[PDB]
Write a protein that binds this ligand. Structure first.
Ligand SMILES: Nc1nc2c(ncn2[C@@H]2O[C@@H]3COP(=O)(O)O[C@H]4[C@@H](O)[C@H](n5cnc6c(=O)[nH]c(N)nc65)O[C@@H]4COP(=O)(O)O[C@H]3[C@H]2O)c(=O)[nH]1
Ligand SMILES: Nc1nc2c(ncn2[C@@H]2O[C@@H]3COP(=O)(O)O[C@H]4[C@@H](O)[C@H](n5cnc6c(=O)[nH]c(N)nc65)O[C@@H]4COP(=O)(O)O[C@H]3[C@H]2O)c(=O)[nH]1
Ligand SMILES: Cc1cc2nc3c(=O)[nH]c(=O)nc-3n(C[C@H](O)[C@H](O)[C@H](O)COP(=O)(O)O)c2cc1C
Ligand SMILES: Cc1cc2nc3c(=O)[nH]c(=O)nc-3n(C[C@H](O)[C@H](O)[C@H](O)COP(=O)(O)O)c2cc1C
Ligand SMILES: [Ca+2]
Ligand SMILES: [Ca+2]
Lengths: 394, 392
């Protein structure tokens, strides 16, 4: 079955320039008997390749290409089924963009290429080609943000309590600064939030979720606290199945020596979406009281920034599924960069969570993320502040 | 109940400089007895104002401000309930941003106000850093444009269980018609709601699919040419007989049309509820060669997570996001982000329900080039309607 594969990559500027002549001669000669067609674009620093052929033949070739030491930062942009070949000729075509001016490159592409009965601008492949020609260095990973240039550098449990809390830090690595702490619920035996809520009767889970926060506020009250935000997770139901849940949280946090502005509530969009008029009453009560709110797991389940027409949170936490393998996904790169920009324009804080690798941290930083949560920096610490690992040079 | 109101605006660059001394002086003197506080930022071309006070007082004030001839392009950025007054003891005060060094303006603000964890402060920072971002350019001012006149030919086609109205999707910068969208009508000329209500509930999926033959027949006889044909389908009507894609393929080819010429429109709200069955339809569409568009993008608040699963050829920005975009900083930020994301992904963006020049101008400023709405073209029963173009 005919398939299209589109990727971008970049060269090593430190090494001798790649023989473009030998590359394209051997490519075109290998591709032809395998039924592989397409075009290669080169701007002096970046490669852009469109590959056409069977799914099995493109998977075999991309594996060899990803593995090729001539280039790095290989980012897949498109991979889908096709009805016709766009490129024709007994081999791989190549354009050195540096030697074309203004729109001569798009002119040479359109010489031998077929884009159907409608205008070429109606083809996604052509639009992706145009975007690389007009502005290719856009998602080119900067040299200081190359992952290869980076490397990475006590408290007891409480079984007597009905619940305990683990703390995970939100960090800003550029200033080596802890931004805030998120409280994660744990069972008396140190079990997960799943295990904890499973032990609670279903009709009592909303009330338990709200009242467990008294133990989170108390813990935060005994810690070197001072002036970091405390994020707590709540179901929206737990907030409005109660006569004054906002006022209850208010009394509970103030008795622990915390401030309204220091406490942030984390809810997801999936949880909120079914009940806007119910939630907007709760958010209003939170705002007036002085408490903050984040939209958590933004990317998982129902997620869109058109949600921001209903209300604007103080913070948006980008889901770990958008963060996962962002270094190779053109789709995830575009989406996260879009979130960063929208929130910057609206004055909404952005946190990327589930950050596990340097490659994730580096690419998230290139698209504008400054606040990070994940195992790479700091793991959740039961009833205390865990150690933070900072990325250092070399 | 305390409320915060934040907006930005632009001066008239060809008119004499307004005495801002007298403006702010009178403002501060009027604001304080009414329980209104805040500040004004000025960079030479743009204003940025924070207003604090009751919902009633700020409503009354902002209404006078919106009608004020001293400025234009008033864009509301924030309106929400507030915990406390950030500018207590300051009815109104102006800061000329050109009179400050790099962090100087922000440090002055903090010395007289009552902080990066505050949304108001972050919005203040954004205007100080890059305030010219959503500043509407001079050639894109609504007053610099005017719509043109011009002839349609609607025709009743008998012996059909349904008819189709055609509305053009246009590119005004090239005065070019991109595509035509087929909108179903009853044999009498009634709405899509009027048509489907006459069909039995369990036969509505089949009817939706089968009716498309009459849309292809229309398109082939209009000569179509190098134009796309957009058709509206329920996802359910696509995974329903086993050969639904193949049926549609046979029907369009017999009409003289090409696969790449036909685009399928499914709404964001209906797709998200059935990813699992839509996936096999997606494979068949791309093997066959037909295109896919996500319609009403934004209406189900799940467009971003949808682009994670699959990438359509086109998205059509919901008419609600287009509505009042000229005064909504929220919608301006959202649409501009969507446009930027789609540009990176190679997805075509079309704005829906474009009714006014104000909408078209601000849509243009955030990157949109394809437009659908009553401003340019109204739906025409079984034919190509007349198209109005904006002229400078
Ligand atoms: N794989 C991976 N995981 C990472 C990484 N960094 C952090 N995590 C983890 O992801 C979870 C936090 O995500 P969440 O969306 O808050 O998801 C949480 C949160 O929703 C939650 N939860 C925690 N406390 C409460 C609570 O008090 N009430 C409610 N309703 N939910 C809670 O239950 C979910 C499961 O939480 P946890 O076991 O505490 O697991 C934590 C955590 O350890 C990473 O780099 N990689
Ligand atoms: N206020 C305003 N409205 C504008 C403007 N421009 C276009 N419209 C209109 O909005 C509708 C097109 O949007 P839609 O989301 O496709 O909404 C359509 C579309 O979803 C639809 N529809 C049409 N044909 C079919 C069909 O064959 N099958 C299915 N399932 N739905 C269809 O039913 C809906 C109702 O369509 P219509 O009566 O044809 O009404 C059209 C149309 O006249 C504008 O500038 N301002
Ligand atoms: C940017 C770039 C594009 C490439 N394109 C192709 C290609 O289209 N076809 C191909 O066979 N090899 C291509 N290669 C080379 C392969 O990665 C790999 O070196 C080659 O398949 C090995 O073949 P050989 O050693 O048997 O000659 C490309 C390499 C780079 C860096
Ligand atoms: C940039 C801008 C900001 C303004 N801010 C205020 C304000 O904060 N308070 C106020 O009373 N008038 C403000 N005005 C003036 C009002 O639009 C309007 O002229 C005034 O409220 C009319 O009331 P008056 O006739 O009693 O002066 C502002 C005008 C402009 C152009
Ligand atoms: Ca959380
Ligand atoms: Ca439609």
């Amino acid at each position: 079955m005919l398939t299209t594969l589109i990727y971008r990559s970049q060269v090593h500027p430190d090494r001798p320039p790649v023989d473009l002549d030998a590359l394209v001669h051997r490519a075109s000669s290998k591709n032809l008997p395998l039924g592989i067609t397409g075009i290669l674009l080169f701007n002096g620093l970046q490669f852009f390749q469109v590959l056409e052929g069977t799914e099995e033949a493109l998977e075999s070739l991309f594996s060899e290409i990803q593995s090729d030491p001539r280039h790095r930062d290989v980012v897949e942009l498109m991979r889908d089924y096709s009805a016709y070949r766009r490129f024709h000729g007994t081999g791989m075509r190549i354009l050195d963009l540096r030697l074309f001016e203004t729109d001569g490159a798009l002119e040479e592409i359109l010489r031998f290429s077929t884009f159907g009965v409608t205008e070429p601008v109606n083809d996604r492949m052509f639009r992706l080609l145009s975007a690389f020609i007009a502005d290719g260095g856009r998602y080119c990973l900067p040299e200081p943000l190359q992952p290869s240039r980076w490397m990475m550098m006590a408290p007891q449990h409480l079984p007597g309590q009905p619940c305990q809390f683990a703390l995970q830090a939100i960090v800003e690595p550029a200033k080596k600064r802890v931004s805030s702490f998120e409280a994660l619920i744990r069972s008396p035996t140190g079990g997960s939030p799943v295990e904890m809520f499973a032990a609670i009767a279903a009709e009592d889970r909303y009330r338990f979720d709200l009242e467990s926060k008294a133990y989170a506020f108390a813990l935060a009250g005994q810690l070197p606290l001072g002036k970091h935000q405390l994020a707590i997770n709540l179901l929206p139901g737990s907030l409005y199945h109660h006569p004054d849940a906002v006022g209850w949280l208010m009394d509970s946090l103030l008795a622990a020596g915390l401030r309204p502005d220091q406490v942030l509530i984390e809810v997801t969009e999936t949880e909120v979406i079914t009940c806007f008029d119910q939630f907007r009453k709760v958010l209003k009560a939170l705002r007036v009281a002085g408490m903050k709110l984040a939209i958590d797991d933004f990317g998982a389940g129902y997620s869109g920034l058109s949600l921001l027409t209903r209300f604007q949170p103080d913070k948006i936490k980008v889901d770990a599924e958008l963060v996962r393998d962002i270094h190779i996904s053109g789709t995830k790169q575009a989406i996260v960069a879009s979130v960063v920009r929208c929130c910057e324009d609206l004055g909404i804080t952005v946190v990327a969570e589930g950050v596990e690798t340097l490659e994730e941290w580096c690419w998230l930083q290139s698209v504008g993320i400054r606040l990070f949560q994940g195992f790479l920096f700091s793991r959740p610490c039961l009833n205390g502040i865990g150690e933070i690992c900072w990325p250092v040079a070399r």
